[PDB]
Amino acid sequence: SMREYKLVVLGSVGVGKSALTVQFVQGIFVEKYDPTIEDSYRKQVEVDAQQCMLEILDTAGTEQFTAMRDLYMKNGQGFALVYSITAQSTFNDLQDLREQILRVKDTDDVPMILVGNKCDLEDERVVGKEQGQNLARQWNNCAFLESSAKSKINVNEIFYDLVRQINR
Amino acid sequence: FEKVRIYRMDGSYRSVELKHGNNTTVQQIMEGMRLSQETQQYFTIWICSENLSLQLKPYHKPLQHVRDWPEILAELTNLDPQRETPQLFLRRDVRLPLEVEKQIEDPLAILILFDEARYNLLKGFYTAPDAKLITLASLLLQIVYGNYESKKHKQGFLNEENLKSIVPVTKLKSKAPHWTNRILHEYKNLSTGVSKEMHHLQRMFLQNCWEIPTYGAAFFTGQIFTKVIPVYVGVNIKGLHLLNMETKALLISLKYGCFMWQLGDTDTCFQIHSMENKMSFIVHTKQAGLVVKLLMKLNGQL
Ligand SMILES: Nc1nc2c(ncn2[C@@H]2O[C@H](COP(=O)(O)OP(=O)(O)OP(O)(O)=S)[C@@H](O)[C@H]2O)c(=O)[nH]1
Ligand SMILES: [Mg+2]
């Protein structure tokens, strides 16, 4: 039967976690955005010749909803840690998320990908691609992509990469 | 802080804050969805369990209905106490006129309508000729697997596991395994003019469902006597439909203006008379009042 994958999208407010998830799942991108408490999406995809059922949790970017946060990390199989290349503060915030996940899983062997979103807004770039790479490397050569929900750059790849990691 | 999950038929949900606790209304909850002011008018909140799915009104307070479900069940059904907790769903408003739906172009509305229609198809609630079911299956293939590739799909692809995702469960073991070649050919031709963009494909699926007579129906439960037969009573913008509960077979389909209804003694049954063939039947159900109220409203909007 078709295997199911519990994916979790984490990161600070406004980085594009919802935009990335909705672009991936529904193929929609609009400038308009609605704030998120907790949304779950489902999508069937093919990864490495195999049909996969993805369940993607789109989270609040805030320390609110602690019960949810602890539960995300307990149940999540793979985690996308998203920041915006236009906002230094969102890049800075990802370190504690990373440490929390490893603490809950009690292993550094967790499917994870570091995502630098909004890569289409080059004129407002604050976080250098080399810095994103530098962080990923610091994180035991964790996977790393720059993405754009708007232009559909690396959107699918984010979820596909997590699935491949889970399959290992 | 309090919130609620609002599900859709595919298992997805969106959490919405309850700013007034259990006193929060359907209207206020609808504001927390991702819909626009325009597209909210296509959908509303339903409360659903295995034995009963009810459309809620804008002034209703969905959490109290959840709270009161045992009492609601005793009132509307013949059932003994049940163990299931209902959930809240976003679903097509039963009152949405087909003429209005046929013009929707909003991608989010289309996908939501699409997913619900797909759900009804697989569940067996859409009766249609084989040709029609085959067209629908082929579109589902295009939507999920992308373009037909002979290498991938010609042989050893459409097995029992993935047929169950493209044809009604009521056809799955009977005659679906003889449509496999017909399904693949329609899928192929779809790939080889027609926009392959996701939302266009989803609309095409919908266009094929729009002419199915039970499309968009609210379903109630009841019984008729020939032996007592448990039935689904479907009411939609086209008319009244009766399904055998067990097999989903379409027993009766009547268009507005071709039949009359009468609510019985108390809300325990309703009678239907044909204007044309002078035949008639009684449906026993404690939802008789709800059915008649809805027949009236939907007939009334034309
Ligand atoms: N140009 C561009 N804009 C984007 C991109 N991703 C998101 N945005 C925009 O940024 C804004 C916030 O996106 P959103 O997806 O709501 O952030 P979030 O991370 O989901 O926000 P939150 O719930 O933690 S508060 C939206 O206006 C959205 O259109 C992108 O890749 N490129
Ligand atoms: Mg969000």
Swiss-Prot record, chain A:
Changing residue 61 to R: In THC11; likely pathogenic. Changing residue 60 to G: In THC11; likely pathogenic. Its EC number is 3.6.5.2. Residues 26-68 are annotated as: Interaction with KRIT1. GTP binds at residues 11-19, 58-62, 117-120, 148-150. It catalyses: GTP + H2O = GDP + phosphate + H(+). GO terms for biological process: calcium-ion regulated exocytosis; cell population proliferation; cellular response to cAMP; establishment of endothelial barrier; establishment of localization in cell; modification of postsynaptic structure; negative regulation of calcium ion-dependent exocytosis; negative regulation of synaptic vesicle exocytosis. GO terms for molecular function: G protein activity; GDP binding; GTP binding; GTPase activity; protein-containing complex binding. Keywords: ADP-ribosylation, Cell junction, Cell membrane, Cytoplasm, Disease variant, GTP-binding, Hydrolase, Lipoprotein, Membrane, Methylation, Nucleotide-binding, Phosphoprotein, Prenylation. Changing residue 33 to F: 2-fold reduction in RAP1GAP-stimulated GTPase activity. It is found in: Cell membrane; Cytoplasm, Cytosol; Cell junction. Activated by binding to the GTPase-activating protein RAP1GAP. Activated by guanine nucleotide-exchange factor (GEF) EPAC2 in a cAMP-dependent manner. Belongs to the small GTPase superfamily. Ras family. It is linked to Thrombocytopenia 11 with multiple congenital anomalies and dysmorphic facies: A form of thrombocytopenia, a hematologic disorder defined by a decrease in the number of platelets in circulating blood, resulting in the potential for increased bleeding and decreased ability for clotting. THC11 is an autosomal dominant, syndromic form. Affected individuals have chronic and persistent thrombocytopenia, dysmorphic facial features, and multiple congenital anomalies with involvement of the cardiovascular, genitourinary, neurologic and skeletal systems. This is Ras-related protein Rap-1b. It comes from Homo sapiens.
UniProtKB/Swiss-Prot annotation, chain B:
It is linked to Cerebral cavernous malformations 1: A form of cerebral cavernous malformations, a congenital vascular anomaly of the central nervous system that can result in hemorrhagic stroke, seizures, recurrent headaches, and focal neurologic deficits. The lesions are characterized by grossly enlarged blood vessels consisting of a single layer of endothelium and without any intervening neural tissue, ranging in diameter from a few millimeters to several centimeters. CCM1 inheritance is autosomal dominant. This is Krev interaction trapped protein 1. It is found in: Cytoplasm, Cytoskeleton; Cell membrane; Cell junction. Coiled coil: none annotated. Interacts with CDH5. Found in a complex, at least composed of ITGB1BP1, KRIT1 and RAP1A. Interacts (via C-terminus FERM domain) with RAP1A (active GTP-bound form preferentially); the interaction does not induce the opening conformation of KRIT1. Interacts (via FERM domain) with RAP1B. Interacts (via N-terminus NPXY motif) with ITGB1BP1; the interaction induces the opening conformation of KRIT1 and competes with ITGB1 for ITGB1BP1 interaction. Interacts with HEG1 and CCM2; greatly facilitates CCM2-binding to HEG1. Residues 12-34 are annotated as: Interaction with RAP1B. Residues 2-302 form the FERM domain. The FERM domain mediates binding to RAP1A and RAP1B and is necessary for binding to phosphatidylinositol 4,5-bisphosphate (PIP2). The N-terminal domain has structural similarity to the nudix hydrolase domain, despite the absence of a nudix box and low sequence similarity with nudix hydrolase domains. The N-terminus and the C-terminus part associate together via the NPAY binding motif and adopt a lose conformation that is disrupted by ITGB1BP1, but not by RAP1A. Low levels in brain. Very weak expression found in heart and muscle. The chain holds residues 420 to 729 of 736 of the full protein. Changing residue 290 to A: Strongly reduced affinity for HEG1. The gene is KRIT1. Component of the CCM signaling pathway which is a crucial regulator of heart and vessel formation and integrity. Negative regulator of angiogenesis. Inhibits endothelial proliferation, apoptosis, migration, lumen formation and sprouting angiogenesis in primary endothelial cells. Promotes AKT phosphorylation in a NOTCH-dependent and independent manner, and inhibits ERK1/2 phosphorylation indirectly through activation of the DELTA-NOTCH cascade.
